[PDB]
C-alpha cells in the first residue's frame, strides 16, 4: 500500500544540507513533550548517520550491481553493432539495480546508526538521565529513526545512482571498443558465438535478429528508467 | 506446433509490464513440459532483465515488511523461471557468472513469518537448491565467497519445515564439497556455529518428527566427521538424541539414514 514519499528530484545530494527540510519530528513523542529543546539535536544526528554510511553503501551497491548488469546487457545486445542503444540500456539497468541494492543495504544500518546518534545526543544534553527518562529516550530515538529512514536511504540511493552511470560506462569500454574497431574495418560487429547460436538454435519467434531489436522489445529497459525502487515513478510531469 | 507457439508469445510478452504478469503465470505452469525452456529464456532479448526487474521491484516491500500474497505469488512465478535457468546444463554457468543469486539474498534475509514471506523465502531457497543439485564445484566456490551460509543457518533455525529442509540441503551440498568442508571447519567459531544449529534442530526433531529433515541433518553430521578437528569436537558435543533410541522408531523405515547414523557413531572413535 505505501507509495514512496519522494521523487528523485525532491532531494539534493550535493551536500548533507539536502536532508534538513525533509526531517520529520512527531510532536507527540513523549521525550519531546517533556523537553521540547531536544528537537534541535535531531538534524545533526541524521546527517552524521548518513555521512558515516553513504560511501560504504554506495561502493557495495555498485559492486554488487555491476557484474549482473554488464553480463546481461552484453548478452542482450551481442548482435547489435551500434553502441548507443546498449549504452542507454546499460545506464538505465545499472542505475535501477544499484538503487535497489542500496535500499536493501542501508535500511537496517541507518536505523541502528540514527538511533545510537540520537540516544547519545539526548543523554549528553539532559543530563545525566534516569530509568524513567532513559526509556523515553530509547523510545524517541527508535521512533525518529523509523520516521526518517526513508529520507536518509533515498539520499544514499541517489548518491549511488549518480555514481553508477559513469562506472558502467567504464566497465563497458571494451564492448564499445569491439563495435568501434569493427566499424573502422568497414564491418558491423557481431559476436560470432552468439550469431551462430541464434541462427542455428533459437526458434524464429524469439531469435535475436541481425537486423536489430524492434523498439517495443526495449520495454524492459525503458521500465528500468521509469520505475526506480524507492522513488516515485516518472511520468509526463 | 500450436502449444509451442503459445510458449513463444508468452516469452515475448515478458518484456512489457502490460503483459508480463500473465506471461509469468502461464510459463511457470509449463516449465516441466518444456525441457528447453531455460535456454529460450536465457537467450531471448530482455527476458532475464525482466525477471530481475520483477525481483528488484519488490525490494521496497521488504523493509518495512509489507509484502502481500499477490505480490509474493507474482515474484515467485519469476523465481520459478529463474530456478528453471539455474537447473539447466546449458544456462547454469552463465546464470552463475551473471551473479543472479545475489539479487535473491535480500529475500533470504527476511524474518517475517507471514505466509507471503515464507513462500518468498522457500521459493528463493529453491533457486539456490537447483544450483547445487547439479553438483558443480564452480557453484560451491561462488556460494562460499558470497556468505549464503549464515542465511541458510538462520533459516534452518527459524523457518517452516519446508524451508528448513531446503536450507539444510544447501548446507549439505556445501559440506559435501572438499572446499566447503574445509571452509566450515577452518575455525572453531565457524564449526561451532554450525554444530550449535544442527544441535538445536535435533532437539526440535525429537519433539516434532520430520523424516526428510532428519535425513539431511544426519548427513551434515556424517560429513562433518570427515574433518579431524570436527571429529574430535563432535565426540564431545554430538546430541545424546543421536546416540540413544530417540529416533529408532522413525528410522526403521529409512535404511539410508540409519546407515549414515551408524557410520557417524562409528567415525567418532
Ligand atoms: N586446530 C585449531 C582448532 C580448530 C580449528 N578449526 C576447528 C574446527 C573445529 C574444532 C576445532 C577447530 C587449534 O586449536
From Swiss-Prot, chain A:
<comment type="subunit">
    <text>Component of the CCR4-NOT complex; distinct complexes seem to exist that differ in the participation of probably mutually exclusive catalytic subunits. In the complex, interacts directly with CNOT6, CNOT6L, CNOT7 or CNOT8. Interacts in a ligand-dependent fashion with ESR1 and RXRA. Interacts with NANOS2, TOB1 and ZFP36. Interacts with TNRC6A, TNRC6B or TNRC6C; the interactions are direct. Interacts with YTHDF2; the interaction is direct and promotes recruitment of the CCR4-NOT complex to N6-methyladenosine (m6A)-containing mRNAs, leading to their deadenylation and subsequent degradation.</text>
</comment>
<protein>
    <recommendedName>
        <fullName>CCR4-NOT transcription complex subunit 1</fullName>
    </recommendedName>
</protein>
<comment type="function">
    <text>Scaffolding component of the CCR4-NOT complex which is one of the major cellular mRNA deadenylases and is linked to various cellular processes including bulk mRNA degradation, miRNA-mediated repression, translational repression during translational initiation and general transcription regulation. Additional complex functions may be a consequence of its influence on mRNA expression. Its scaffolding function implies its interaction with the catalytic complex module and diverse RNA-binding proteins mediating the complex recruitment to selected mRNA 3'UTRs.</text>
</comment>
<comment type="similarity">
    <text>Belongs to the CNOT1 family.</text>
</comment>
UniProtKB/Swiss-Prot annotation, chain B:
<dbReference type="GO" id="GO:0033147">
    <property type="term" value="P:negative regulation of intracellular estrogen receptor signaling pathway"/>
</dbReference>
<keyword id="KW-0943">RNA-mediated gene silencing</keyword>
<dbReference type="GO" id="GO:0042803">
    <property type="term" value="F:protein homodimerization activity"/>
</dbReference>
<dbReference type="GO" id="GO:0019900">
    <property type="term" value="F:kinase binding"/>
</dbReference>
<dbReference type="GO" id="GO:0000289">
    <property type="term" value="P:nuclear-transcribed mRNA poly(A) tail shortening"/>
</dbReference>
<dbReference type="GO" id="GO:0032991">
    <property type="term" value="C:protein-containing complex"/>
</dbReference>
<dbReference type="InterPro" id="IPR011989">
    <property type="entry name" value="ARM-like"/>
</dbReference>
<dbReference type="GO" id="GO:0003713">
    <property type="term" value="F:transcription coactivator activity"/>
</dbReference>
<dbReference type="GO" id="GO:0005829">
    <property type="term" value="C:cytosol"/>
</dbReference>
<keyword id="KW-0007">Acetylation</keyword>
<dbReference type="GO" id="GO:0019904">
    <property type="term" value="F:protein domain specific binding"/>
</dbReference>
<dbReference type="Pfam" id="PF04078">
    <property type="entry name" value="Rcd1"/>
</dbReference>
<comment type="function">
    <text>Component of the CCR4-NOT complex which is one of the major cellular mRNA deadenylases and is linked to various cellular processes including bulk mRNA degradation, miRNA-mediated repression, translational repression during translational initiation and general transcription regulation. Additional complex functions may be a consequence of its influence on mRNA expression. Involved in down-regulation of MYB- and JUN-dependent transcription. May play a role in cell differentiation.</text>
</comment>
<keyword id="KW-0539">Nucleus</keyword>
<comment type="subunit">
    <text>Homodimer. Component of the CCR4-NOT complex; distinct complexes seem to exist that differ in the participation of probably mutually exclusive catalytic subunits. Interacts with MYB, ATF2, RARA, RARB, RARG, RXRA, RXRB and RXRG. Identified in a complex with ATF2 bound to target DNA. Interacts with NANOS2. Directly interacts with ZNF335.</text>
</comment>
<keyword id="KW-0963">Cytoplasm</keyword>
<dbReference type="InterPro" id="IPR007216">
    <property type="entry name" value="CNOT9"/>
</dbReference>
<dbReference type="GO" id="GO:0033138">
    <property type="term" value="P:positive regulation of peptidyl-serine phosphorylation"/>
</dbReference>
<dbReference type="GO" id="GO:0031047">
    <property type="term" value="P:regulatory ncRNA-mediated gene silencing"/>
</dbReference>
<keyword id="KW-0805">Transcription regulation</keyword>
<dbReference type="GO" id="GO:0005154">
    <property type="term" value="F:epidermal growth factor receptor binding"/>
</dbReference>
<comment type="similarity">
    <text>Belongs to the CNOT9 family.</text>
</comment>
Amino acid at each position: 500500500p505505501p507509495q514512496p514519499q519522494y521523487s528523485y528530484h525532491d532531494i539534493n545530494v550535493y551536500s548533507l544540507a539536502g536532508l534538513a527540510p525533509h526531517i520529520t519530528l512527531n510532536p507527540t513523542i513523549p521525550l519531546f513533550q517533556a523537553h521540547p529543546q531536544l528537537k534541535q539535536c535531531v538534524r545533526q544526528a541524521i546527517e552524521r548517520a548518513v555521512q558515516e554510511l553513504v560511501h560504504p553503501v554506495v561502493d557495495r551497491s555498485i559492486k554488487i550491481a555491476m557484474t549482473t548488469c554488464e553480463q546481461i546487457v552484453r548478452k542482450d545486445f551481442a548482435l547489435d553493432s551500434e553502441e548507443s542503444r546498449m549504452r542507454i540500456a546499460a545506464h538505465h539497468m545499472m542505475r535501477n539495480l544499484t538503487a535497489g541494492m542500496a535500499m536493501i543495504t542501508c535500511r537496517e544500518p541507518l536505523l541502528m546508526s540514527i538511533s545510537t546518534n540520537l540516544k547519545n545526543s539526548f543523554a549528553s544534553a539532559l543530563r545525566t538521565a534516569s530509568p524513567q527518562q532513559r526509556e523515553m529516550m530509547d523510545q524517541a530515538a527508535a521512533q525518529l529513526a523509523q520516521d526518517n529512514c526513508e529520507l536518509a536511504c533515498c539520499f544514499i540511493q541517489k548518491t549511488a545512482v549518480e555514481k553508477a552511470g559513469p562506472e558502467m560506462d567504464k566497465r563497458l569500454a571494451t564492448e564499445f571498443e569491439l563495435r568501434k574497431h569493427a566499424r573502422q574495418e568497414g564491418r558491423r560487429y557481431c559476436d560470432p558465438v552468439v550469431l551462430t547460436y541464434q541462427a542455428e538454435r533459437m526458434p524464429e519467434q524469439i531469435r535475436l535478429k541481425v537486423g536489430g531489436v524492434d523498439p517495443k522489445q526495449l520495454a524492459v529497459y525503458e521500465e528500468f528508467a521509469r520505475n526506480v525502487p524507492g522513488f516515485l515513478p516518472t511520468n509526463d510531469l | 506446433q500450436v502449444d509451442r507457439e503459445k510458449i513463444y508469445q508468452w516469452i515475448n510478452e515478458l518484456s512489457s509490464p502490460e503483459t508480463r504478469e500473465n506471461a509469468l503465470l502461464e510459463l511457470s505452469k509449463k516449465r516441466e513440459s518444456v525441457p528447453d525452456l531455460a535456454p529460450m529464456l536465457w537467450h531471448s532479448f530482455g527476458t532475464i532483465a525482466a525477471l530481475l526487474q520483477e525481483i528488484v521491484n519488490i525490494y521496497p516491500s521488504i523493509n518495512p515488511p509489507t509484502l502481500t500474497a499477490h505480490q509474493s505469488n507474482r515474484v515467485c512465478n519469476a523465481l520459478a523461471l529463474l530456478q528453471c535457468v539455474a537447473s539447466h546444463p546449458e544456462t547454469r554457468s552463465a546464470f552463475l557468472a551473471a551473479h543472479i543469486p545475489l539479487f535473491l539474498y535480500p529475500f533470504l534475509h527476511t524474518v517475517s513469518k507471514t505466509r507471503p514471506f515464507e513462500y518468498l523465502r522457500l521459493t528463493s531457497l529453491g533457486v539456490i537448491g537447483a544450483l547445487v543439485k547439479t553438483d558443480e564445484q564452480e557453484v560451491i566456490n561462488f556460494l562460499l565467497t558470497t556468505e549464503i551460509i549464515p542465511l541458510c543457518l538462520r533459516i534452518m533455525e527459524s523457518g517452516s519445515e519446508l524451508s528448513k529442509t531446503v536450507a539444510t540441503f544447501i548446507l549439505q551440498k556445501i559440506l559435501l564439497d572438499d572446499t566447503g568442508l574445509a571452509y566450515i571447519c577452518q575455525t572453531y567459531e565457524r564449526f561451532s556455529h554450525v554444530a550449535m544449529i544442527l544441535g538445536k534442530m535435533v532437539l526440535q526433531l525429537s519433539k516434532e518428527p520430520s523424516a526428510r529433515l532428519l535425513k539431511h541433518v544426519v548427513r551434515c553430521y556424517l560429513r562433518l566427521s570427515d574433518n579431524p578437528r570436527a571429529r574430535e569436537a563432535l565426540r564431545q558435543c554430538l546430541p545424546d538424541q543421536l546416540k540413544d533410541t530417540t529416533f529408532a522408531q522413525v528410522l526403521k523405515d529409512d535404511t539410508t539414514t540409519k546407515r549414515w547414523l551408524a557410520q557417524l557413531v562409528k567415525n567418532l572413535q
